[PDB]
Amino acid sequence: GSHMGTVSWNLREMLAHAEETRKLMPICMDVRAIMATIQRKYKGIKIQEGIVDYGVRFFFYTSKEPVASIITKLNSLNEPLVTMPIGYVTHGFNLEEAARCMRSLKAPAVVSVSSPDAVTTYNGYLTSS
Numbered sequence: 001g002s003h004m005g006t007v008s009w010n011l012r013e014m015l016a017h018a019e020e021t022r023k024l025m026p027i028c029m030d031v032r033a034i035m036a037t038i039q040r041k042y043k044g045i046k047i048q049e050g051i052v053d054y055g056v057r058f059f060f061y062t063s064k065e066p067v068a069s070i071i072t073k074l075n076s077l078n079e080p081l082v083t084m085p086i087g088y089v090t091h092g093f094n095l096e097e098a099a100r101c102m103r104s105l106k107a108p109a110v111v112s113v114s115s116p117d118a119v120t121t122y123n124g125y126l127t128s129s
Contacts, residue, residue, distance in 0.1 A: 003080065003108040006123045008116040011037060014082050018056045023110065024081045025056040026074060030063045030090040063090045071104045081109040085122075099125035 009017065011034060018025045027034050029047065038045065038058065045054040049065070052058045059077075061070050067087040074081065085098035093101065095118075102111055103126045113122050 004110040005108070006119050006126075007110060007112050008114075008119050009082075009112045014084075014112060015041075015056070018082045022079070023056075024059060024074075024077060024079050026059040026061075026070070026081055026083050026086070026109075028063070028086055028090050029060050031084075034084070061086075067091055067101050068104070071101070074105050074107065074109070078107050081105075081107060083109050083111060085111060095122065096125045096128075099123075100128075102126075 015025065015037070017023070027038070029035060029049070035047075038055070039047075042055045045052055045058070047060060049060060049062050052060065059074070067090075070086055085093075085095075085102050087093045087101040088095075088098045091097075095113075099122050102109060111122070113119055
């Protein structure tokens, strides 16, 4: 209900949700927690910095490109999305920086944290003053 916003799913839930539904799954190449699970599950795919059209429209990126430029590309797809906060490790951010990054994307990326309790904490930073 509503746009889901900010939640506590897990990697399997987040993946399977956008298998079943029509959300993009943007993923950083720099995340073995996720990357490995794609090449494990989906065999018939090629990694690049581009769009892929195998499984869940996977839009991969190299750490080479700035976080702001990923937001910029994603702003043009204008689909609802499901991801983890892109900038946390591939830029060495913390949870607040990681939030104020994602907020920049107009299209609704459903996004998750490592606990149901932190779901509001994350949203907290979107609406900081």
